[PDB]
Amino acid sequence: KDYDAYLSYTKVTGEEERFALEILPDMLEKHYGYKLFIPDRDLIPTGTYIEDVARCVDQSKRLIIVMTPNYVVRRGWSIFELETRLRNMLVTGEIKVILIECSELRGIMNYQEVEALKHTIKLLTVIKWHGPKCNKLNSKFWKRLQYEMPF
């Protein structure tokens, strides 16, 4: 409805950081022309924060999870499992999720936890980001992401 995609990332290394905070958003908005909802730019944390996130996600055509190392450590995806309506949206397939992997999941628990997150998402697509080489304009990474986005 309102946005092409809701960007979900954590910001507290180096390449992964520049990718999630700059390259990814710039490519999507300035190169492809998508309209993103970026919390750090568009969301005012207030007393209805949890409700505002659920609403804004519902108003997005896609939910993008940028799984960088810090995102795994801080479990930046927790809110999507915490908020009842969001979790149901995920399980029911009301939300199409694009999970971009930017970290080799080191650790039994992290791996199984992430596996469990994926299993709660019906309309999920995972895209691997191998590194800076994937940043080059028109790379297989970008072609795949473009395909997964709306329009």
Add this chain to the structure above:
Amino acid sequence: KDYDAYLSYTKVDTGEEERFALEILPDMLEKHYGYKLFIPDRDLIPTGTYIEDVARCVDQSKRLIIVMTPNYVVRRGWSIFELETRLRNMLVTGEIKVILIECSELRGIMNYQEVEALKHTIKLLTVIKWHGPKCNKLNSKFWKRLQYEMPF
């Protein structure tokens, strides 16, 4: 059934709230009060069934203890309970009582709000504020309150 409480905590890679969470809290409940706890770092071996094992171990406990230190808040140590369908149900439908021990002074609109939401997902809930090391002294108002919230 099998345990009096499942201890949910987080541990970094300093020694005040983490001292309590890892050392004092467990020793006091087991040595002094004689409770039987399920402590992951001691009784849980992570495998391909880790998620289901936690669900099963929690279900085998009379209480879920969440030790909310700043690290637990930063790492969102409570996530697995909202992620695993069965665990989340236990909390929402009240199949298990949760004793949430607030060690940190939760600051930041987002963390505060996420914690508020976490609490709203728990039907059977009790919160105990751990002001500081002073609450660690034998038979203090803190220990009296905790024992009361425990089984037996």
